[PDB]
Amino acid sequence: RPAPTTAGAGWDAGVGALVNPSRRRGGTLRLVSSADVDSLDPARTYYVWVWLLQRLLNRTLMAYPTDPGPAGLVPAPDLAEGPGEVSDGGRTWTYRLRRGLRYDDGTPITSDDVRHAVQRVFAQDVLPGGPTYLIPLLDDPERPYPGPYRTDEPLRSVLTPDEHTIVFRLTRPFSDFDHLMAQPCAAPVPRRSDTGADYGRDPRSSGPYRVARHEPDTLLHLERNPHWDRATDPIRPALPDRVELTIGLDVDVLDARLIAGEFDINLEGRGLQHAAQRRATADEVLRSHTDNPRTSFLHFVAMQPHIPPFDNVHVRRAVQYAADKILLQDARGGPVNGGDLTTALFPPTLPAHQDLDLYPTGPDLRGDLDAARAELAAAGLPDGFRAVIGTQRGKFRLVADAVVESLARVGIELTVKELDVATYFSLGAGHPETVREHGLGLLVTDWGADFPTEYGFLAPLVDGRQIKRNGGNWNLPELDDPEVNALIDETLHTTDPAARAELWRAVERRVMEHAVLLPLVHDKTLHFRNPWVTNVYVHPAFGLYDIQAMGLAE
Ligand SMILES: NC(=[NH2+])NCCC[C@H](N)C(=O)O
């Protein structure tokens, strides 16, 4: 019976809890996406939803557990027997592999294959597209590693004492290393099957499923991996016999067919679009099949000290005070569906999350214009000034327009520069030269961490060492405060998680003191779940349903 005709578990039932629990194996899970995968090479994917799909295809040393609660944020032993063994003050990480495990072709998984996967990341000329956190942590600047296609000498910082042991000797302490071991670029790839640029056409699988067929822009079918051993996998229930992804639908077409029951779940997970949002949130039966989680993305405005007059802290504080947070949230969808207002940066899933509101916007949250004008006077610009805000067409433009309206009230006169959506991070707001070319003193953007920790969340946004001069830059103000950098370094060797949280609170406070980032909202989304899908929950590390946990009702 289609969803509109029978009530489900209830609004938000899959947020922090598991809906429709079952161990029943069998059936075909019908997934849908508006977009094709970015890559089927585990090293070359960045899409959050493809990382989710990778939980079906490939195992890793550590993986996020199948848990809707806070424990879901802590990597658990997967291919490893236990969590990474830390020595040398957070600089050496040792893992011990489970024995006798096999790929889909029946061949053995060994520590050499995990080293090979990590080595492949270095071949950015052949395998671009995935995360590269591992490179600075493992590369010797005095003796650079050119990747495994250009030399057969192994990476010197990665030891394999035997077939079931791997040791990573890092260039610096790194508290969050288990998280890097949970990313798909660290899933084992045996060198014997590594076809390099072509690997995605026929990747090996260590997970419960393997690729049966991929037809670009059309479909992806997965079948069981006959060599995966259920008894050896503490993460994956592997309930369906088959997973079939339909690719390429218009987003409203997708929502309509999903709600009609023609597909079980939206894999891409961008949420219901406006039309279906209205329909679902208004209907008592449809509400019972909907979850409204935080996505852990932050929507914010960045201000760039390299673009006068934004070099002046008082100019930046004036902007913070004059922000109409209500208007800005409304631009984000927000009378009722505009995410969650925030005056700070960390999502509330992180330990360091704190009350921090250095520039309050008045009793109605619409702006403290007196405070803003006083800041403008401090800047020597009491009547305001002219500037340019960079944005994208669409939702980001409505937000930019809300900034224009907000700031006009204190004589800050903004014009809007739109930049190409596709390349916004590579060549647009994410490229320091572009920001200078168009004189973009303000930039509208959003961000989600590549792993659910304070470092993963905040370092790319504020750490001076993370400024990407050639594009893909996420530190838009190009903040390079040695005190912030030093505090971040301290967190990375601090073993005690509580002391670590306090240091991160100091970092976030210092960042807000600089006033280079204006937080707007933490984003939220509406996911629809058909009632015959079992084990549905929003994975706290992803903000999307954990597809791999799902089954089908009898
Ligand atoms: N694997 C992921 N978490 N992908 C989505 C986030 C990618 C990147 N941090 C961004 O905000 O654009």
Three state DSSP letters for 33-81: ECCCCCCCCCCCCCCHHHHHHHHHHCCCCEECCCCCCHHHHCCEECCEC
Q: Is 47 left (phi over 0), alpha (psi -120 to 50) or beta?
A: beta
Q: State which ligand 1 atom lies nearest to the alpha carbon of 45.
A: 1
Ligand 1: centre distance to CA 179 (Å): 14
Rounded to whole angstroms, the Cα distance separating 265 from 20 reads 14
Q: How far is the CA of 8 from the centre of ligand 1 (A)?
A: 31
With 0-12 / 13-18 / 19 or more C-beta atoms within 10 angstroms meaning exposed / middle / buried, residue 420 is exposed
Which atom of ligand 1 is closest in space to residue 447's alpha carbon?
A: 11
Quote the distance between the C-alpha of residue 165 and its chain's center.
29
Q: How far is the CA of 544 from the centre of ligand 1 (A)?
A: 13
In this structure, what token pair is assigned to residue 530? 């058909």
Torsion of CA 40, 44, 49, 53, to 10 degrees: 40
Lining residues, ligand 1, CB within 6 Å: 46, 48, 51, 447-448, 450
Residue type, 285: V
- Determine which residue's CA is closest to atom 6 belonging to ligand 1: 448
Distance 424 CA to ligand 1 centre (A): 13
Which mutation among 447, 457, 461, 473 tests ligand 1's pocket best, with the greatest number of atoms within 8 A of CB?
447
As a CATH number, domain 294-524 is 3.10.105.10
Nearest-atom index, ligand 1, CA of 297: 11
269 and 549 Cβ atoms separated by less than 8 Å: no
The two structure tokens encoding residue 404: 């224009």
Say how many CA atoms lie within 13 Å of 517 toward its Cβ: 30
Q: Which residues contact 478 (CB under 8 A, 6 or more apart)?
A: 304, 305, 306, 432, 464, 467
Q: Measured in angstroms, how far is the CA atom of residue 433 from the centroid of ligand 1?
A: 22
What is the position in ligand 1's atom list of the atom closest to the CA of 51? Answer: 1
Centre of ligand 1 from the C-alpha of residue 230, in Å = 30
Residues linked to residue 386 through DSSP beta bridges, in sequence order: 413
Please give the distance, rounded to the nearest whole angstrom, from the Cα atom of residue 131 to the centre of ligand 1: 9
Q: Residue 202 and residue 373: Cα distance in Å, rounded?
A: 61
Token pair of 42, please? 């585990």
How many angstroms separate the Cα of 183 from the Cα of each of 8, 37, 47, 268, 526? 33, 16, 12, 18, 25
**The three-state (H, E, C) secondary structure of 405-452, written as one string:** HHHHCCCEEEEEEECCCCCHHHHHCCCHHHHHHHCCCEEEEEECCCCC
Ligand 1 centroid to Cα of residue 494, in Å, is: 26
User: Per-domain residue ranges for the chain?
Assistant: 1-293+525-554, 294-524
**Residue 46 Cα, ligand 1 centroid: separation in angstroms?**
7
What CATH number labels 1-293+525-554?
A: 3.40.190.10
Atom of ligand 1 minimally distant from the CA of 448: 11
- Experimental technique for the deposited model: X-ray
Which of 47, 53, 450 should be mutated for ligand 1, with most atoms under 8 A from CB?
450
**Ligand 1 mean position, distance from CA 75 (Å):** 18
Please state the atom number of ligand 1 nearest to the C-alpha of residue 47: 4
Q: Whose CA is nearest to atom 12 of ligand 1?
A: 447
Q: What is the resolution of this structure in A?
A: 1.7
> Among the atoms of ligand 1, which is closest to the Cα of residue 183?
1
Which residues lie below 8 Å from residue 143, measured CB to CB, with a gap of 6+? 156
3-class SS at 282?
helix
Q: Whose CA is nearest to atom 8 of ligand 1?
A: 448
Q: Which atom of ligand 1 is nearest to the CA of 46?
A: 1
In this structure, are residues 401 and 391 in contact, taking their beta carbons and an 8 Å threshold?
no
Residue of the CA atom closest to atom 3 of ligand 1: 450
CA–centroid distance, 446 to ligand 1, in Å, is 10
Mutate to test the pocket of ligand 1, among 48, 64, 461 (most ligand atoms within 8 A of CB): 48
d(CA 99, CA 118): 20
Beta bridge partners of 211: 222
Ligand 1 center from residue 107 Cα (angstroms): 33
For CA atoms 287, 293, 295, 299, give the dihedral sign. Answer: positive
CA dist., res. 376 & res. 411, Å (int): 10
Q: How far is ligand 1, taken at its centre, from the CA of residue 297, in Å?
A: 9
Residues in the chain: 554
Taking the centre of ligand 1 as the mean of its atom positions, its distance from the CA of residue 223, in whole angstroms, is 28
Judged by phi (left if over 0) then psi (alpha if -120 to 50, else beta), residue 471 lies in left
**Closest residue (by CA) to atom 4 of ligand 1?**
48
Backbone angle region of 196, left / alpha / beta, with phi > 0 → left and psi within -120 to 50 → alpha:
left
CA distance 387 to 438: 11
Which atom from ligand 1 is nearest to the alpha carbon of 542?
3
45, 46, 421, best to mutate for ligand 1 pocket (most atoms within 8 Å of CB): 46
CA of 115 to the centre of ligand 1 (A): 24
* Helix (H) / strand (E) containing 315: helix 313-321
Q: How far is the CA of 459 from the centre of ligand 1 (A)?
A: 14
440 within 8 A of 400, measured Cβ to Cβ? no
Q: Given phi > 0 = left and psi -120 to 50 = alpha, else beta, which region is 391? A: beta
User: Which residue minimizes the CA distance to atom 1 of ligand 1?
Assistant: 48
Residue type, 338: G
Sign of CA dihedral 118, 226, 73, 9: positive
Q: Cα Rg for the chain, rounded, in angstroms?
A: 24
Residue nearest to atom 2 of ligand 1 (CA): 48
Helix axes 251-259, 274-282, angle to 10 degrees: 30
Question: Which ligand 1 atom is nearest residue 460's CA?
Answer: 9
Index of the ligand 1 atom closest to the CA of residue 449: 9
